[PDB]
Design a protein around this ligand. Structure first.
Ligand SMILES: Nc1ncnc2c1ncn2[C@@H]1O[C@H](COP(=O)(O)OP(=O)(O)O)[C@@H](O)[C@H]1O
Ligand SMILES: Nc1ncnc2c1ncn2[C@@H]1O[C@H](COP(=O)(O)OP(=O)(O)O)[C@@H](O)[C@H]1O
Ligand SMILES: [Zn+2]
Lengths: 247, 626
């Protein structure tokens, strides 16, 4: 009864949505759009199977691009520190086999056996990738099937199975010239091609400006950090209830 | 024979245990600690083995004991049990005795005097008490070691308890029952036996090479990867591999030195003296000296590290390699590397699984090896792109995350990086923007703390100064005190930023902002350098003067005052009409003020404070008899 009441307070209040928006990664000041985006990604849509048997993906992908100054990595760190299941990785450190699945010779026999990559791990969870634009295209391609079909297909060395890849991809990246070339439009500042951009349900490009009123508060809070509604523990309890609904 | 006389040794240790004091220092040590140990439920006492050297008979005991530690430890177990029993019931001070009476105790001396070194140990030095130091790298999983054997008779189910003495298993020949006399009917049940934890830990040892230690009982998993470790135990080689049976493990100056430190800190030329004494072969360069010394001091670490990183972007003939090579030797030991002669694996690590260990192991690279220290990277402009990508997460979170085939792990690389980079082309060219003179991309260049443009200008006067500084040096504070001061400041002072010091950060950052490359990264430096300055002053808080000096240092390093705000170019020269106008207006104002007050004259300090909130103007007025 007390557990139900505690979980009920977080659901039956009028302003709960804004309260949860203003609670993701409280250390990062501003950037409310990404706070909404991550909150929605953590509560991915209901998966549906057609009466024809065709499946509909329910997980949400997010990509964020920012200047080298805007704190884009702290969101990834907060997600991997908060998500029940999460994996953090770097764009250049990762490789094709290390993300999806590894074909390796097994013990107790001469046949092969899979090993879980970054995507198979934290299945039914959020996978975080930093420096996404730095990734080689040849190993960005392999993420596509997990991003849209929620599956990993292997046809290598005696393995022909299809594996569950129900993961929400969260990525961070930088513009093509590091700085946001504000002279040009959004089309020319990104090296990502259309196929990969089309697979992100949410997409944010955050910028920096010399507005005095913004920079003063930014300095005040980033200095308070070095000087020192709903708690982070409560959000997992709320999500464990919310995730089961099927609108 | 045995150097340990049981009654003589126990009486000697009884006398020591009741009479020791260090020389409030006058209070007795173990006379106080005995009650605390009787209070404690712990199963062991860490004997302060430095007391063995502080007292004469205990030094003699050490010299006798160097060959027989086990006997004295075994005696001390019973001695501890008897002392507990006496202090509990014989002294009638306590009544909880049963579990202490039944259990077994141990004692671990943790500050024994060191030996002559690992490689100097002789074949007869085996089985002797030794003391060593180093760094731990790897750990083996928990391995059970047999203590009790549980034998059951396979024809009548009778059970016997058999224990191991000196590594020997003795299978019972016949069943002990009067009726059942069947020979060889005893069998061992594997999972009813009793075992104890044994673990092998790898340690990179530095004598006063790597040694694989062995630990037993509660010592397992107390040492883990990366631990800073001092070892007190037994050197072993048995029929012959070299290994250490650990008896205890440690997870880690005079008042005249304090007086010297205070004297050097109090004198007004402290910064000047430090810069002058750090590097005699490098002339002047006050800002560079202050910056590198501040990097050695480092900022405050809170949980937000203070690892200051500096880049030298001077002309490719200025003494910069001579500074980094010297820093590699004067600072507490780190690793000297070059960007050209390094790779991504070379910096971070090589990581692979192990069949024996059944967990990931690391071959530490230089960047991770520098954990907690300083690393030097020459040819920073020549580092490969894949290697440069590692620096990003290193400088942003002091971590390195790797996700490859079968391996997914993160490694810590908390270290300060000092780097030098030649400008694009054969020389720095001020005809191009300052950003375009450096071959580092904006994301990597914008996150450094200090970048120094140490240019060389051809001028006969300065050339003569430098030549006469250098040529007379090779004719015909000490480094010890410098290292002592550096260690002391990091050891003690933890400065906290004051309100007034905090306030100036806002204005300084806004002023740097409105001239727009003034990203938020430099605001990290605006506290990192301030804390290091406060530490260097040894002041327990960060002063507003410290903040202003740090801001000035950043400005001079970047050289904004000589930098063109329109194109980023640099003036070559860094009497003017604006100077004339300012001097004329100042002279008029001071001429009005000096007579507006109800006095014919006033002190120049008060006039300066009244006007500035000058000397040349008043001197010229005096020349005109005004
Ligand atoms: N809104 C903010 N609140 C607090 N800190 C911030 C904010 N924006 C930027 N920062 C600071 O600036 C740094 C930005 O680093 P980041 O841009 O994440 O590096 P990378 O681009 O390599 O991921 C962070 O360390 C963070 O402390
Ligand atoms: N200010 C100085 N003090 C002492 N030696 C100097 C100075 N400037 C240049 N040199 C000498 O010039 C030589 C060139 O060294 P340096 O400029 O540091 O590296 P590089 O040769 O790669 O340019 C060194 O041998 C150094 O002794
Ligand atoms: Zn029997």
């Amino acid at each position: 009864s007390d557990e139900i009441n505690e979980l009920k307070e977080m659901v039956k209040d009028e302003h709960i949505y804004d309260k949860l928006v203003r609670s993701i990664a409280p250390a990062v000041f501003g950037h409310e759009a990404v706070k909404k985006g991550i909150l929605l990604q953590m509560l991915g849509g209901v998966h549906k199977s057609t009466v024809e048997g065709i499946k509909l993906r329910g997980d949400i992908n997010i990509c964020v691009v920012g200047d080298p100054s805007t704190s884009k990595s702290q969101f990834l760190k907060y997600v991997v520190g908060f998500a029940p299941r999460s994996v953090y990785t770097s764009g250049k450190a990762s490789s094709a086999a290390g993300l999806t699945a590894a074909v390796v010779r097994d013990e107790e026999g001469g046949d092969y056996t899979i090993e879980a990559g970054a995507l198979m791990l934290a299945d039914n969870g959020i996978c975080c990738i930093d420096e996404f634009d730095k990734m080689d295209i040849s190993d960005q391609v392999a993420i596509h099937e997990a991003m849209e079909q929620q599956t990993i297909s292997i046809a290598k060395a005696g393995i022909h199975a299809t594996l569950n890849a129900r993961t929400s991809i969260l990525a961070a990246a930088n513009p093509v010239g590091g700085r946001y070339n504000r002279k040009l439009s959004l089309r020319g500042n990104l090296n990502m091609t259309a196929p990969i951009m089309s697979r992100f349900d949410l997409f944010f490009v955050i910028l920096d400006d010399c507005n005095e009123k913004i920079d003063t508060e930014l300095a005040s809070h980033i200095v308070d950090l070095h000087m020192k509604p709903f708690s982070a523990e409560q959000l997992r309890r709320y999500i464990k209830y919310a995730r089961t609904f099927k609108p | 024979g045995t150097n340990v006389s049981i009654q003589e040794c126990t009486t000697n240790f009884r006398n020591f245990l009741m009479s020791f004091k260090y020389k409030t220092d006058e209070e007795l040590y173990y006379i106080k600690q005995l009650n605390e140990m009787r209070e404690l439920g712990t199963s062991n006492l860490n004997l302060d083995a430095r007391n063995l050297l502080a007292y004469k008979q205990t030094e003699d005991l050490y010299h006798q004991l160097l060959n027989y530690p086990q006997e004295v430890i075994s005696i001390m177990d019973q001695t501890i049990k008897d002392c507990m029993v006496s202090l509990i019931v014989d002294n009638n001070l306590d009544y909880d005795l049963d579990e202490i009476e039944t259990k077994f105790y141990k004692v671990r001396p943790y500050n024994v005097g060191s030996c002559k070194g690992m490689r100097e140990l002789n074949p007869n030095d085996i089985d002797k008490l030794i003391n060593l130091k180093g760094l731990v790298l790897r750990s083996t999983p928990v391995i059970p070691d047999m203590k009790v054997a549980f034998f059951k008779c396979n024809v009548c189910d009778h059970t016997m308890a058999v224990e191991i003495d000196r590594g020997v298993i003795q299978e019972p020949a016949r069943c002990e029952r009067i009726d059942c006399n069947e020979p060889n009917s005893m069998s061992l049940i594997h999972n009813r036996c009793s075992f104890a934890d044994k673990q092998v830990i790898k340690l990179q040892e530095t004598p006063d090479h790597s040694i694989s230690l062995c630990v037993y009982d509660e010592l397992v998993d107390s040492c883990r990867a990366g631990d800073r470790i001092e070892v007190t135990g037994t050197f072993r080689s048995i029929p012959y591999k070299t290994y250490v049976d650990v008896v205890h493990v440690k997870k880690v100056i005079t008042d005249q030195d304090l007086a010297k430190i205070r004297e050097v800190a109090a004198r007004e030329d402290l910064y000047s003296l430090l810069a002058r004494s750090i590097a005699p072969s490098i002339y002047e360069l006050e800002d560079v000296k202050k910056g590198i010394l501040l990097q050695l001091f480092g900022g405050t670490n809170k949980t937000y590290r203070g690892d200051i990183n500096i880049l030298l972007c001077g002309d490719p003939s200025t003494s910069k390699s001579q500074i980094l090579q010297y820093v590699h030797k004067i600072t507490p030991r780190g690793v000297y590397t070059s960007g050209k002669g390094s790779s991504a694996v070379g910096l971070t690590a090589y990581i692979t699984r192990d069949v024996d260990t059944k967990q990931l192991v690391l071959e530490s690279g230089a960047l991770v090896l520098s954990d907690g220290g300083v690393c030097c990277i020459d040819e920073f402009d020549k580092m490969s792109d894949s290697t440069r990508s590692v620096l990003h997460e290193v400088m942003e979170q002091q971590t390195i995350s790797i996700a490859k085939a079968g391996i997914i792990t993160t490694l810590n690389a908390r270290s300060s990086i000092l780097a030098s980079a030649n400008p694009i082309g054969s020389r720095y060219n001020p005809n191009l923007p300052v950003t375009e003179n450096i071959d580092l991309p904006p994301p990597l260049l914008s996150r450094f703390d200090l970048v120094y443009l140490v240019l060389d200008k051809v001028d006969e006067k300065n050339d003569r100064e430098l030549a006469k500084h250098l040529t007379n040096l090779y004719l015909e504070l000490p480094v010890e005190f410098l290292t002592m001061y550096i260690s002391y400041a990091k050891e003690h002072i933890h400065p906290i930023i004051t309100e007034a010091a905090k306030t100036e950060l806002v204005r300084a950052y806004v002023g740097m902002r409105k001239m727009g490359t003034a990203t938020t990264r430099q605001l990290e430096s605006m506290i990192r350098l301030a804390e290091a300055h406060a530490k260097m002053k040894l002041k327990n808080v960060v002063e507003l003067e410290d903040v202003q000096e740090a801001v000035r240092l950043i400005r001079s390093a970047i050289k904004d005052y000589a930098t063109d705000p329109k194109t980023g170019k640099i003036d070559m020269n860094l009497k003017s009409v604006i100077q004339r106008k300012l001097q004329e207006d100042l002279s008029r104002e001071i001429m009005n003020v000096l007579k507006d007050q109800a006095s014919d004259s006033m002190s120049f300090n008060e006039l300066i404070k009244q006007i500035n909130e000058i000397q040349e103007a008043l001197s010229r007025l005096q020349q005109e008899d005004k």
